[PDB]
């Protein structure tokens, strides 16, 4: 992609792809959002808003040519700059296996946190209603192993009456899961009992929510809409360092909320 003016950064082949791979590794396990919603293939660097498919009436019956606006859903562009030490990446070429690019590791994670935030609670400013804002899809849950199983099956039953069925997934706070794993200490693995009561579903632990969440990955209920996917580009050179960045273009919508169940 030509605009990330990467060709102009003072970096070798090895260097560029060493930076890329590091960020790819982190994004893969830290974009908790994408682990269970679906992504809508990159629409292009210039895609500006995703159509919502409604009109905004703006006329009296006093006017003959009645009319309105088409509701769209503008995409966020984000740009997280960071600096890397040149005379250090140079070291990659000298042989050095691990080069010090913690400057990048953090920036990546912060971008990751950003996106999840939008998937999970949304920017009111951008018009996207987050996952957790769907109050009508909240049910109460205990704190025993047994209380969780109960929740699951009651959930599977709310789905059953909406027709909603995919493979089912448990999104769950990392620490909360450590806690359920306390009382279920070697009688029989909680992992498998949850996966069973989910009918062959999977379980995603995450530090992006504080409670729990249940969805069906049957697909097409949680669109993350990509314009230009997460890329790395070059901004400038600060004497003895390089300023790269991390751009993305996106938005999000919960289409069929009935594929969603929130917890306590």
């Amino acid at each position: 992609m030509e605009f990330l003016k990467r060709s102009f950064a003072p970096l070798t082949e090895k260097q560029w792809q060493e930076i890329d791979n590091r960020a790819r590794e982190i994004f893969k396990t830290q974009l908790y959002g994408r682990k269970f919603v679906d992504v809508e293939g990159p629409y292009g660097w210039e895609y500006a808003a995703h159509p919502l498919g409604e009109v905004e009436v703006l006329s009296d019956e006093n006017e003959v040519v009645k009319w309105g606006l088409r509701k769209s859903l503008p995409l966020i562009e984000l740009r997280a700059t960071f600096t890397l030490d040149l005379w250090e990446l140079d070291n990659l070429e000298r042989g050095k296996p691990n080069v010090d690019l913690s400057s990048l590791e953090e920036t990546v994670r912060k971008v990751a946190e950003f996106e999840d935030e939008v998937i999970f609670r949304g920017c009111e400013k951008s018009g996207v209603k987050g996952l957790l804002s769907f109050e009508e899809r909240k049910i109460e849950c205990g704190s025993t192993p047994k209380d969780l199983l109960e929740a699951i099956v009651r959930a599977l039953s709310i789905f059953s009456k909406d027709g909603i069925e995919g493979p089912y997934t448990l999104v769950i706070n990392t620490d909360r899961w450590i806690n359920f794993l306390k009382e279920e200490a070697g009688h029989y693995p909680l992992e498998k009992r949850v996966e069973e009561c989910l009918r062959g579903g999977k379980i995603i632990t995450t530090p992006r929510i504080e409670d729990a969440l249940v969805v069906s990955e049957r697909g097409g209920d949680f669109k993350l809409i990509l314009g230009q996917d997460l890329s790395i580009g070059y901004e400038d050179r600060e004497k003895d360092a390089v300023r790269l960045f991390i751009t993305e273009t996106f938005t999000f919508q919960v289409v069929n909320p009935e594929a969603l169940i929130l917890l306590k």
């Binding site: 990467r6 790819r24 994408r34 890329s231 580009g233």
Partner: peptide, 8 residues
């Protein structure tokens, strides 16, 4: 070129 290419 560029990009990064993640999407699950």
């Amino acid at each position: 070129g560029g990009d990064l290419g993640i999407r699950k």
